[PDB]
Amino acid sequence: RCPSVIEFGKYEIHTWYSSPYPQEYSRLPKLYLCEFCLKYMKSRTILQQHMKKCGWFHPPANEIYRKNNISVFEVDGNVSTIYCQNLCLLAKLFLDHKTLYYDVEPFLFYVLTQNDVKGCHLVGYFSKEKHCQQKYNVSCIMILPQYQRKGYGRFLIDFSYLLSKREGQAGSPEKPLSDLGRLSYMAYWKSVILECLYHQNDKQISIKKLSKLTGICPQDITSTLHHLRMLDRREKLIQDHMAKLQLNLRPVDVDPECLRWTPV
Numbered sequence: 001r002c003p004s005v006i007e008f009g010k011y012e013i014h015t016w017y018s019s020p021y022p023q024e025y026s027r028l029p030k031l032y033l034c035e036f037c038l039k040y041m042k043s044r045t046i047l048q049q050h051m052k053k054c055g056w057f058h059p060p061a062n063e064i065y066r067k068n069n070i071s072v073f074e075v076d077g078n079v080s081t082i083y084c085q086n087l088c089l090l091a092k093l094f095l096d097h098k099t100l101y102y103d104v105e106p107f108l109f110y111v112l113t114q115n116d117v118k119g120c121h122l123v124g125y126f127s128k129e130k131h132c133q134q135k136y137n138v139s140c141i142m143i144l145p146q147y148q149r150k151g152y153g154r155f156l157i158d159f160s161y162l163l164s165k166r167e168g169q170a171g172s173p174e175k176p177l178s179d180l181g182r183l184s185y186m187a188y189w190k191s192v193i194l195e196c197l198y199h200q201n202d203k204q205i206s207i208k209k210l211s212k213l214t215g216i217c218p219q220d221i222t223s224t225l226h227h228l229r230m231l232d233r234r235e236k237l238i239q240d241h242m243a244k245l246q247l248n249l250r251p252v253d254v255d256p257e258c259l260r261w262t263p264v
C-alpha cells in the first residue's frame with residue numbers, strides 16, 4: 001500500500017494500511033523513519049547518515065511517568081507539533097480509519113517508551129483531545145507490531161484511566177473502536193472488574209465500582225452483560241479463577257506512585 005514496508009530503528013515493520021505520507025514518499029517501496037524525531041526519509045543511506053545529525057534520543061515533552069524500563073512522555077500537540085504530526089502518519093499505518101494529522105495542536109500525545117543505553121525507544125502511544133466534544137479519555141491508541149501482545153496495550157489503556165481517574169472525570173475511548181482495540185478494552189474491563197470482586201469481600205455498587213475504577217457505568221455493565229455476571233452480580237467462582245490466574249506472572253503494570261501528573 002502506501003507503503004508496504006518501513007524501517008524503524010533496527011526492525012523492519014510491515015504496514016497494515018496506507019498513510020498520507022506524501023505521494024513522493026508513499027510510492028517508495030520502503031519508508032525509513034528514524035526511531036526518535038520520527039522523520040520519514042527515502043533511503044537507508046539518507047537515513048543512515050541523518051542519525052549523525054539529530055541528537056534526539058527520546059520524545060519531545062516531559063516524562064510524566066518512569067518506572068523500571070518503561071516511560072511515558074506527555075507530548076503537547078501545540079508545543080511540539082511536527083513530531084505529533086509524524087506520530088499520526090506512523091500511527092495511521094496501523095489504523096484503518098484515522099482522521100486528524102495536520103491538526104495536532106488540539107490533542108495531547110502520550111508516548112510510551114522502552115529505555116536502554118541506546119535511548120528511550122518509542123513502543124507506542126495514545127491520543128487525547130484537549131477540550132472534549134464528548135468526555136473522551138482516549139481518542140486513539142496504538143502499539144507498534146514488534147511490541148504487541150506483550151501487555152503494553154493494557155498498560156497504556158490503564159494509564160489512560162489513571163489520567164481521567166485523578167481528573168475525577170470518568171471518560172471512555174472514542175467508541176468507533178477497531179477490532180483489535182475492541183478486544184483490548186472488553187478484556188481490560190473484565191480483568192479490572194473481576195479484579196475488585198477478589199479485592200473487597202464486601203459488596204456495594206456499580207456507580208461505586210465506577211469512580212474507584214473509572215470504567216464508566218455504560219461500559220463494565222455491558223462488560224458484565226457480556227459475562228455471566230450481568231445484574232445491577234458476583235460469580236465467586238471466576239472472580240477466583242482470574243485473581244488465581246494473575247498469580248503466575250503479573251503484568252508490566254502502571255504504578256500510580258511512579259507518575260508525576262497534576263490534572264487540568
Ligand SMILES: CC(=O)SCCNC(=O)CCNC(=O)[C@H](O)C(C)(C)COP(=O)(O)OP(=O)(O)OC[C@H]1O[C@@H](n2cnc3c(N)ncnc32)[C@H](O)[C@@H]1OP(=O)(O)O
Pocket residue numbers: 094095138139140141142143144147148149150151152153154155173174175176177178179180181182183184187188191
Ligand atoms: C479508541 C480507539 O481509537 S481504538 C483504536 C484501536 N487500535 C488499533 O487497532 C491500532 C493497532 N492495534 C494495536 O496497536 C494493538 O493491537 C492494541 C492497542 C489493540 C493492543 O495493544 P497490545 O499491547 O498488543 O495489547 P495487549 O498485549 O495489552 O493485550 C491485548 C491482547 O491480549 C489478548 N487477551 C486475551 N485475553 C486476555 C486477558 N484476560 N487479559 C489481557 N489480554 C487478553 C487479546 O486478545 C489481545 O490480543 P490480540 O491483539 O491478538 O487480539
Ligand SMILES: [Zn+2]
Pocket residue numbers: 034035036037038039051054055056
Ligand atoms: Zn531523527
